[PDB]
RNA sequence: AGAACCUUACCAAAUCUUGACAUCCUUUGACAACUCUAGAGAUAGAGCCUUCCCCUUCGGGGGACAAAGUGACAGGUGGUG
RNA sequence: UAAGUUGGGCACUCUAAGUUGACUGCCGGUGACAAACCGGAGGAAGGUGGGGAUGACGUCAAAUCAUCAUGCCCCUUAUGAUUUGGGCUACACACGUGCUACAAUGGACAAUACAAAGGGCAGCGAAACCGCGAGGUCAAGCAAAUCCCAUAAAGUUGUUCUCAGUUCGGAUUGUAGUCUGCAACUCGACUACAUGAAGCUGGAAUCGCUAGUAAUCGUAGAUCAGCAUGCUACGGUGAAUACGU
């Protein structure tokens, strides 16, 4: 198409893999696998919000880092939660799992995280404009090089499919020393699906 | 890209065009006894001149050099004379198929000798 | 004609006059010199007393004067007198194992 | 091409059998797109599902250029004017 | 003796070019070079460096060279001969970057793009 | 439809050679890999996500 | 603009035979063409015995065409690269177009038949000669 | 980027209707391998065996289900770029 | 030593990761002195060396609800669905693509050479035996610079066909076999034999190619239990043409 997620092409360059395992032939049973923890994640998603996980497959241990929105919670009070957590994926797997729980960076700068905010901001029948509003001050108040986030679909309860884009600083795109955060979400409340591409540009 | 009109206003341009060539462009020192063949686009905005002047390749280049000033005068006078609406623009070229044409008849010699 | 069959091309050589009609044919090249020797000397026709001693042997399980010609009169008369679950797809040019007839053009068809 | 001998489908094989111990039968119902012909279905009739329904044919005595897969094409009328 | 050593590179062809003294001669693989490549009367071209360089005293040669096709091959000698030629002394280094056939050349079969077919042709225009 | 295939394929089968390997994510009957047992868009999708770790495009 | 010629031959006398190997090379393959024209030259060279050289120069310096045509047509001078590219040229097109029996044949009857200034090649040389001529209206 | 069956969305036939599949409640549970029979096959009847395998402080959970009832339902290659 | 099989080194090539390098970076001239332009030297790369991904704003109510999701309408004892046959591929046909020939630069026969890339654990089948061939059978090595798939074809070395519907040509069907599939008929491929139509470069129109190029001739991979005239990737021979808008 026109435009890739830049994302698909940064990786390999500057930026390592989603999935990491050691490589070998039986890379469709690893896929499969690992395809059943990326549905498993939404749980935790539908609540701390985490961006994206990256999973290690030791010699015969599995190891994996989530981005959640705040880590208060999901590490529990003094580990009330990371347990079951931890058994519930070691059965669903058919095999163990050892959780190292990140938070974030600290500001609210990433992509995915604020892509999931607006898209529940529209689910929550809030404008779209004011939120978009909200999003890129506090964006270039927490200091980025390049913010922009797209719209598609029935805005405002229409029946017509429309695109904005609200974009600030200096957004390389076609550079590849760009160092970017690509996101997606999906958002609706009676109308269809309203899909959103956050874009963040931090550092070169 | 030509139509019957635009024939008819090259034939009656090149009249007066060659009438005020030879006949109100004083001031330039270099006055030529030139013959003319115009042509132009088919809206009238485009028009080409083509001519032959007498002298060295120094003497044609005065005679250019005294035209691309005139090129006012003449086209104040042109636009004065005729009914057209919008003056087209001239610019002036000399006519290359009369030397092209004479190396033309050059090669005849060639086919003469052979068989003869 | 002279060795066998009906007619065959004189002052030409013998790998295309056994060739010229129903016969038997030159893809058995191979076969025929490894067996036989009587081959294409020159371009002209030499047969002499040496000359068909033992080729006509070597042919000679190859009986091609009507036989073919009997083989596919008797498989088209079982194709029309059987029921023809072949004979209504050689109508249109279609063999046993199919064409999927696109371009019916005016070779095999009316 | 060929392999494991004739090919057949070991049921409709049953069936006649049954039906070939005593007086032969005339009306087989069958579907008949895994069998070849062989010379145990001689004096029979089978009704090939060619798609829409089967329609009896009878065994001949010559079955060497046919078979009983097929007797008229499912492509009815062949998707031709003539 | 000493002998000196080149090497050509062109169309994934490989000649280790290896100099020695003698009359003036090849040995392609241990072989000559008229039968080991198929129709190759154009050994003018490879004796070229003979009659261009280094006056006229030409300097057998022994090569091993694998890949590449035959032609590609023999020019790949030209440029091993060349570098020793040159690696012999700079004096003619100039003179040769002045009579050609020292800058290798780089081209080689490039890669194939998506719409061309079994003739590297470009896809047609919807005419009528 | 394929949401009896789905099925169908997971089913019991007649013989040795009855099924087809199709997409586990998705349901796309035609242009599977049989390494990945994933579609041709699947693929796509995931190598744009970057969870295989095999090498991008542009490297010849 | 650049041309990429090349210099070396087999038969170092004339460099035309590098535009010869290159015309011939039909279908991708040369040794066979490249066979054929050694062929071309030996019975050239052997019918009418002289040195190839002379007889392939009569026909390369007789059939060069003086008058070309470049919905209007005029007559243009011709460069000598392009006079001799079309010279040669015309030469492969009259021997695929003769037919006749053997390799050569028809190519060393078609360079001695230039040589001698008859034959198809001066009558193309001439319907070039007479139909320019008969685009001379357009020169003025 | 694989049309003999499966493949395929259609027709015909054998056919069921919480349906082919899947989840939620319960009677509960390691999911039945192989044969004979009616049947074009499906499917069905059986012989046969699937058969707490993990924690079990004796349950229970889960965990699969053998069949069953239940309201949702599931489902549409039905349509709408 | 048949052969890099062996002892010896990484010398060369090649082999993967750091580093210079072509960046206008220098000179002469042109250019308003500047930018820039031309020529040159050095220089593999001279005016971004070549090739590939990265396709602005947007246009096409362009395509996809049939990857997936997806709001709404409908059937929901049928508009859902278990199993068997076909069917998307039929032909008075036309269309566009692709493959094969109209040829003696050729066909046919015999000895003979040059390539890289990719895949391989139950798959890649070393050698070999048998068979008319397809292929049947046994069998070596290898989780891979070891071993295999696998030979490169044209081409070099000699011969024949001698201008014909041709020793061009394989469309057409028939006979008997081979791999895989329980099954090769609508419905795989291949082989041995026979049969031998048109087509002798194609009218107006018409497409493709700017240098390792076209054109040509081969090779490998996926698609697959088996089935590629389609696709991708690799390799071999290898030209003129652009004066000029």
């Known amino acids: 198409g026109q435009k890739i997620n830049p994302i698909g092409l940064r990786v390999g360059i500057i930026r390592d893999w989603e999935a990491k395992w050691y490589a070998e032939k039986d890379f469709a049973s690893l896929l499969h696998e690992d395809l059943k923890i990326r549905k498993f994640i939404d749980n935790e998603l539908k609540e701390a919000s985490v961006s994206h996980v990256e999973i290690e497959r030791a010699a015969n241990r599995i190891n994996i880092a989530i981005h959640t929105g705040k880590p208060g919670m999901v590490i529990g009070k003094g580990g009330s939660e990371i347990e079951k957590l931890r058994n519930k994926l070691n059965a669903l797997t058919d095999k163990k799992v050892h959780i190292n729980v990140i938070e974030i960076k600290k500001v609210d700068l990433d992509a995915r995280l604020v892509a999931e905010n607006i898209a529940r901001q529209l689910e929550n029948r809030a404008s779209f404009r004011r939120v978009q509003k909200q999003a890129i001050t506090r964006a270039m108040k927490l200091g980025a090089k390049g913010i922009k986030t797209q719209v598609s679909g029935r805005l405002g309860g229409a029946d017509i499919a429309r695109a904005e884009q609200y974009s600030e600083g200096t957004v390389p795109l076609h550079t590849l020393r760009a160092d970017i955060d690509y996101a997606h979400a999906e958002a609706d409340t009676t109308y269809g699906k309203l899909g959103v591409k956050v874009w963040i540009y931090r550092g070169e | 890209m030509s139509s019957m009109r635009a024939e008819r206003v090259g034939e009656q341009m090149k009249k007066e065009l060659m009438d005020i060539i030879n006949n109100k462009v004083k001031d330039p020192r270099v006055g030529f006894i030139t013959i003319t063949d115009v042509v132009l686009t088919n809206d009238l905005s485009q028009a080409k001149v083509f001519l032959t002047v007498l002298g060295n390749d120094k003497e044609v280049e005065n005679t250019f050099k005294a035209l691309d000033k005139a090129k006012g005068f003449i086209k104040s006078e042109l636009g004065s004379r005729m009914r057209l609406r919008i003056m087209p623009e001239l610019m002036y070229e000399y006519d290359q198929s009369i030397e092209y044409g004479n190396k033309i008849e050059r090669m005849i010699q060639d086919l003469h000798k052979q068989d003869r | 004609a002279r060795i066998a069959g009906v007619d065959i091309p004189r002052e030409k050589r013998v790998v295309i006059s056994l060739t010229y009609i129903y016969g038997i044919g030159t893809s058995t090249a191979q076969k025929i010199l490894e067996e036989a020797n009587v081959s294409a000397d020159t371009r002209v026709k030499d047969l002499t007393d040496d000359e068909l001693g033992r080729i006509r042997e070597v042919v000679d399980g190859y009986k091609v004067e009507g036989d073919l010609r009997r083989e596919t009169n008797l498989n088209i008369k079982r194709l029309m007198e059987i029921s023809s679950y072949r004979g209504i797809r050689h109508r249109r040019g279609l063999p046993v194992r199919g064409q999927k007839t696109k371009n019916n053009a005016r070779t095999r068809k009316g | ?82 | 003796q000493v002998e000196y050593r080149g090497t050509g590179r062109r169309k994934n062809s490989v000649a280790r070019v290896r100099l020695v003294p003698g009359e003036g001669n090849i040995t392609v693989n241990n072989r000559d070079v008229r039968e080991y490549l198929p129709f190759e009367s154009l050994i003018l071209d490879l004796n070229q460096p003979f009659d261009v360089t280094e006056t006229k005293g030409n300097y057998d040669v022994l090569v091993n060279v694998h890949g590449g096709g035959f032609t590609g091959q023999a020019q790949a000698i030209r440029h091993g001969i060349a570098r020793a030629l040159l690696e012999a002394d700079p004096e003619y280094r100039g003179s040769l970057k002045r009579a050609g056939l020292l800058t290798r050349d780089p081209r080689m079969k490039e890669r194939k793009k998506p719409g061309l077919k079994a003739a590297r042709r470009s896809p047609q225009f919807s005419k009528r | 439809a394929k949401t009896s295939m789905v099925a169908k394929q997971q089913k019991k089968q007649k013989y040795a050679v009855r099924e087809y390997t199709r997409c586990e994510r998705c349901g796309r009957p035609h242009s599977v890999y049989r390494k990945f047992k994933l579609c041709r868009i699947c693929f796509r999708e995931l190598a744009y996500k970057g969870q295989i770790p095999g090498v991008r495009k542009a490297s010849w | 603009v650049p041309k990429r010629d090349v210099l070396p031959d087999p038969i170092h006398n004339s460099k035309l035979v590098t535009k010869l190997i290159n015309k011939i090379m039909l279908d991708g393959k040369r040794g066979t063409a490249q066979r054929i024209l050694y062929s071309a030259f030996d019975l050239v060279e052997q019918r009418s015995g002289r040195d190839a050289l002379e007889v392939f120069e009569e026909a390369i310096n007789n059939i060069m065409p003086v008058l070309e045509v470049k919905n209007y047509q005029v007559p243009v001078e011709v460069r000598p690269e392009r006079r001799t590219t079309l010279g040669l040229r015309w030469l492969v097109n009259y021997a695929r177009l003769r037919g006749e029996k053997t390799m050569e044949d028809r190519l060393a009857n078609e360079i001695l038949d230039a040589a001698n200034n008859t034959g198809g090649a001066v009558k193309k040389r001439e319907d070039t000669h007479k139909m320019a001529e008969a685009n001379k209206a357009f020169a003025h």
């Open chain 4, 1 to 82: 091409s060929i392999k494991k001998g004739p090919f057949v489908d070991e049921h409709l094989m049953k069936k006649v059998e049954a039906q070939e111990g005593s007086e032969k039968k005339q009306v087989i119902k069958t579907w008949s797109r895994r069998s070849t012909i062989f010379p145990n279905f001689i004096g029979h009739t089978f009704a090939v599902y060619d798609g829409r329904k089967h329609v009896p044919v009878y065994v001949t005595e010559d079955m060497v250029g046919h078979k009983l897969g097929e007797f008229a094409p499912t492509r009815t009328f062949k998707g031709h004017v003539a």
